[PDB]
Design an enzyme around this catalytic site. Structure first.
Site, PDB file in Angstrom:
ATOM      1  N   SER A  60       0.805  -1.250   0.050  1.00 16.86           N
ATOM      2  CA  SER A  60      -0.020   0.125  -0.083  1.00 16.86           C
ATOM      3  C   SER A  60       0.782   1.198   0.000  1.00 16.86           C
ATOM      4  O   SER A  60       1.822   1.121   0.428  1.00 16.86           O
ATOM      5  CB  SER A  60      -0.883  -0.077   1.260  1.00 16.86           C
ATOM      6  OG  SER A  60      -1.449   1.153   1.499  1.00 16.86           O
ATOM      7  N   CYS A  61       0.505   2.442  -0.773  1.00 18.58           N
ATOM      8  CA  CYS A  61       1.143   3.691  -0.455  1.00 18.58           C
ATOM      9  C   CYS A  61       0.264   4.673  -0.609  1.00 18.58           C
ATOM     10  O   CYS A  61      -0.840   4.718  -1.477  1.00 18.58           O
ATOM     11  CB  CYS A  61       2.125   3.572  -1.613  1.00 18.58           C
ATOM     12  SG  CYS A  61       3.111   4.774  -1.903  1.00 18.58           S
ATOM     13  N   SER A  62       0.438   5.796   0.220  1.00 13.30           N
ATOM     14  CA  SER A  62      -0.243   7.068   0.083  1.00 13.30           C
ATOM     15  C   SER A  62      -0.549   7.573  -1.471  1.00 13.30           C
ATOM     16  O   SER A  62       0.599   7.862  -1.853  1.00 13.30           O
ATOM     17  CB  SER A  62       0.212   8.111   0.988  1.00 13.30           C
ATOM     18  OG  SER A  62      -0.386   9.435   1.048  1.00 13.30           O
TER      19      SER A  62
END
Lengths: 240, 245, 249, 263, 262, 250
Positions: E158-160
């Site tokens: 996951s990544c912003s």
């Protein structure tokens, strides 16, 4: 809704049933049900049944028979003659239902013959996994939790879907379709359909695999022609 | 022998005929005969005839008419009724004979009515009612290219043309509707950059033949081709894994 | 009128001028004008001029110079400084008119200094042309593109530049100011891509982004070059090197 | 200087020789020398020689022969046995020189026997092969560049015209009739699939195929047929060079330099 | 030393803390910390917290919530309002730290109110990163996860969504939604690892290079789909996702120079 | 014929040996033997031995050591100098036997020195071993592959090397001399290709040519890496870098 809670709901269900007959296909779902049933009820209260039939591959039969014995169960093969039913033989659009009647009737009979209290399957007839609200996530966690690592990684579908509605199934054209799909799988394409249009074979692949297929075009053309197709084609729309 | 000897043979044959009608398709062979006829006999003694029909594309007809004009010829379009003959419409291996008979029959009538001494076509090395002077002069494809260049000819149709009847199985009845469906399908495929293509008709299945060396380039078009050919009436749109012929 | 009449009109017009300067681009039209001028007036009385500039490739310049020489013309290169005109530098819709005006002004100076009676171009059946007094003999003789092709065949001409190239200003949005650096960056990028086997290519300039347009039928062939093109264009100054999924134009 | 001035220099040299033998390869340069020799000296005073050998295709030879016939020259085919020279048979880096020596020696023998005053060619470890043989390169003596050849050919109305197989073998590898035939058949087959620019480099039991890199993706559909066809020609392994034909020429500047360093 | 010694360090650290709140993202690292916390302290002394926000997808939140429940934890959702911070809203180069500060402030508030002795996160080699204190590298995390029967975690990192916008570009619900919808569409085509980088009228798609050749059959559908989402030009980054990690030695060095120049 | 009787034969065989040294590769078979040896005899009475050598990768050595440690076994690495045997160095068709002979000879030396009653390997029902006296208890107890999986499941074993590797000698033609350099060159090349996402690959060594074998269905994916692979393998010492058109094990 914890895993421990779902496993307990499953355990409580099997214990109440006492003796079960498991419809066993060899996928991870029925694998989980059969192992749980053995653990909770013991080998001599569980009967695993693997159906042998024309609508499914002999590789899937032999794999499930081997896997069920591998999990420590008394396994029994049973042979269904699907094409003896006129609805299946002529590939009617409702033939799926006549095939299920044949299937569950046979296992109902086996289960009443051996004293089982229910026939169990692997939906996620009693679908205990579904009853305990198992998702694929839960089935993966519990199987690994029991040490299970071996099952049929491709779940198959009835070869009837390869023929147009109304097309009469024959032993020869079914064998021709299953031989073609087996060849295509051996090249690295586990998800493939060889749709049957008499002299024309129409191959369905996932669209993201179609570029990978190009190196095999000529070999597939020649192999499927030797199996009796005159024209060997690739559907531009892909799988579905 | 030499290209000069073959050309001299062709010149002598044209001078002896004096006045000719040329069956002109727009290919290189037919372009060479038409230009040599014009160069040796002059515009007033040559009639260029371009056949229009349901079995060949309007595009190829329009290109041939402009090229014949471009070459310096007085050009005449003529429209053939191949499907009015039952042998052609029912698409047997004998359809070819009746098509050729109708074609040369029409050309001979044109030639009879303008006083030509012969009908000329572009047949080369490798019909009793026509003269194939390149074949009589022993022209191979290589001699055609060499003489075309020497004459400065550069504008011809470069893709071999073929009767649309080859897209239907023998014994299948040709109809205006299914011909149009195949024609529209191939026209779309050519517009994407595939000048050599066949859409073979198998009722609800289209079976596309491409040169194998082009099949890898085709992938970017799969979905658009699938949808376009479905809107032309095909249910299933497929690529023949064997490629073109 | 017949093709023979149009050629005769063109011959009489050339004979009357006696000495001409020909704006030569290498396309079929200026090839036909140059070839007719040579056949009618002789190599000694025709000068072919090819313009070099920052807005067009050196390869197109060198090919036009070689084609004129192969036709048998005395040929002269001349270099235009298009970016010195602010109308061109600021990349407006009328930039091409000021480019044409500078081009024909240079051709008139060349023609004045070599004794030519007219500057000829290859226009067929334009304000900067008429303002500078340059002559389009193919248009005056009613040549359309089919007549050009017919006479070129008759003269045995088979070699000319098939792709009329396009000013590099089309790689920048209108109103984006052209600079020597961003032109050179785009020109070098397209030159590398053509060297890989893609003669039809555009490198559209979006500041730190290069957006490459290729004919869609060529995009699959491009795959083997992705990393080399990525690193080559970054070393020319782009931050991101991208391929337009829509293809050419 | 001038094309006319260059053409006149070539005309005067031909007139002075009176009768010549011309080394004819079918390229535009030897096509021009042959046509100018005919125009200045007449058909009776020119002999065109086309060499056949194991190092070039029968296709190339036949092409040259018919083109010399097309120009109207009396033509003589002669076959060279290049493999009789140990430098060529063992494919040393000076093999080109000994091939030229054998070629010009044969032309000199033809010229001496038909009364020609010189051998002419189409040019623009010891003495020069020509200088040793006495061959004249009149286009070179008249300072013709390639554009001049191309300009004069159109002016004279020439409109039709056309690498040694030893380049497919590593230096020090012995050429044989069999392995030459094996390489030539492999390349002919690959050309027949639609790849006109191709090399099959010979590394004993390995074929190493060089293609222009922009073609390699298209080639995939032929991998299995190419593998089986070239194995039946005698290769044990059939491979595709990942660097392609003329490796490095299409690399970015940094990696192009790295590939140079590795060579 | 051995994995057993590292696991023993982690067990001893948990027992000393007795009650903990776990920052749970669903990645393999967080999953191991949570699972170990449950095994050592029991369900009553562990609270798993999954942050929901406008910078991450609902799919990642739902996946994390189901995995924490499946492991047997009392799990609690918490919603962060990252866009109320001007550094995050205007996407400055330090945005990540104001996001992290706001995140850990929320976890501290929760931990203070449930009596936890510490907040735990999943960082490896006042929040405590016990995996790092126990010298776990990535291979040790995988080895112990496997030994513990852990199967389900987020296989794709996951990544912003902030990473899809240039520094200085203002994030809005519209452009965030536009990026998330474009990436969701690409994932639905069979590309689980993808970035749609936002450059105003240009979309720049990053894929793993080993997938780029498979993408060709989707070019036209992707072009049309992303244009209907509001991009004018839809492009494929030729360097791909994680540019340079799969390059030869020389050109990996060159790509690192290029990336450093910005 | 049942799993229970086979497990019992294996237990009784281990109890009679009391002390053992286990040739440990990390595959499922030697994992099962090491786990059964530990459960029946106790940690102090089992030695897991992992061979480090030039014919296998450092990464494979490291994985086997950590897998044995994870099982709870005392493990010791031992380093073999396979290239000192001329049959192995000159890569004859009999090299595979002389390597096995050197391997089992070393294990017998370790076993003699630690008081083991036998060396155990993981061979199952499906030459150097018998000559050295090494014992294949799974083979003696009639384990087939399915029995190995059934018992590993029963013991809760779920972690092992799923891909069994091949000695690097298979990358060299018979009669080609192995050296430290060309072995390293082959290994580094295969390591680079695996890092690109091609787990099944061989770089066959033909002096100045590298001949890469890939599964044919991956060759189209490979195209984007052609130039990087070409330059990387040239920097490792190959002059020409090629792709075998026949694919994996052509």
């Amino acid at each position: 809704a914890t895993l421990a809670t779902k496993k307990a709901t499953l355990v409580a269900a099997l214990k109440d049933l006492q003796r079960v007959t498991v419809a066993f296909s060899g996928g991870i779902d029925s694998t989980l049900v059969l192992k749980m049933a053995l653990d909770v009820l013991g080998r001599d209260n569980v009967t695993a049944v693997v159906a042998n039939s024309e609508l499914f591959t002999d590789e899937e039969f032999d794999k499930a028979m081997s896997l069920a014995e591998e999990l420590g169960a008394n396994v029994q093969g049973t042979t269904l003659d699907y094409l003896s039913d006129d609805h299946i033989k002529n590939n009617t659009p409702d033939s799926w239902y006549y095939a299920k009647k044949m299937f569950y009737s046979r296992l109902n009979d086996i289960a009443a013959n051996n004293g089982s209290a229910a026939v169990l399957d692997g939906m996620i007839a009693r679908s205990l996994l579904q009853e305990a609200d198992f998702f694929k996530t839960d089935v993966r966690a519990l199987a690994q939790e029991l040490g299970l690592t071996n099952w049929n990684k491709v779940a198959s579908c009835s070869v009837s879907s390869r023929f147009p509605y109304g097309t009469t199934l024959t032993h020869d054209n079914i064998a021709q379709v299953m031989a073609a799909e087996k060849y295509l799988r051996s090249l690295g394409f586990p998800t493939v359909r060889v749709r049957f249009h008499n002299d024309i074979a129409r191959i369905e692949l996932p669209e993201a695999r179609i570029g990978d297929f190009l190196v095999f075009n000529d070999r597939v053309n020649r192999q499927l022609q030797s199996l009796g197709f005159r024209y060997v084609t690739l559907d531009l729309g892909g799988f579905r």
